[PDB]
Amino acid sequence: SLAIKLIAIDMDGTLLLPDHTISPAVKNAIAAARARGVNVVLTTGRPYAGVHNYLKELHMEQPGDYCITYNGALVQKAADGSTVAQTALSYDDYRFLEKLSREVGSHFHALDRTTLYTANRDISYYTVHESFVATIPLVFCEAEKMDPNTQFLKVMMIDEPAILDQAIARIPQEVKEKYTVLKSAPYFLEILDKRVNKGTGVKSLADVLGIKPEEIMAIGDQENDIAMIEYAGVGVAVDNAIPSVKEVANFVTKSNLEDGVAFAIEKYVLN
Ligand SMILES: [Cl-]
Ligand SMILES: [Mg+2]
């Protein structure tokens, strides 16, 4: 066996309590693993705007600290947010997916490196949620007035769960082949370029750093975490994970409410 050198950790439902804080147990386990030289990388659907305050809270400011944001469409240096890898959707892909959302009956919003956009005039509660909780500015703009050179890192279909699940059932299987289409919560569907996901993001960084899959632990809760939990040598699901994520995990740890991230770090790293 090999020791763990990198821990990839999802944020919502996994690192963070429901009030969006990091418990003292989880902050102390992450500090103990980084004091030993183990690299810890927050690996999330969120935009960077929703990550950089937590990087500073976790003292992820050293030259060898990274984060993976926008569901793997962006890999960054944590000290200053600079880009290490990017793959964006095109403008034609934005217009196709914006129209698809109106056919299948879901609200929709798009993100670039700094801003959250929607063409919905009745703005979903879950677009206000993303703007407020991920601390990212919100701009209303009609689809046909969007700048065609916007750099579309990810888009999302967001809605009440019953509306979003009805919408998912109406998406043709071809679209699910053409793009990365994965839920991150009952009310969020993440959509990005098919070349990128959290698994590709973790593998990109592991190859930059000379770290084998065997030396990686990944921790998550929802459908958009399955590929990184399968790629890692130690794939971990919190107890509040959906069933399909527990199925592919090596280990099911405690819920986020009971500090499952700290318990996993103690099991595979600190002990
Ligand atoms: Cl996520
Ligand atoms: Mg999550």
Swiss-Prot record:
Keywords: Hydrolase, Magnesium, Metal-binding. The keyword Hydrolase applies. This is Sugar phosphatase YidA. It catalyses: sugar phosphate + H2O = sugar + phosphate. Changing residue 10 to A: Loss of the phosphatase activity. The gene is yidA. It holds the Pfam family Hydrolase_3. Belongs to the HAD-like hydrolase superfamily. Cof family.
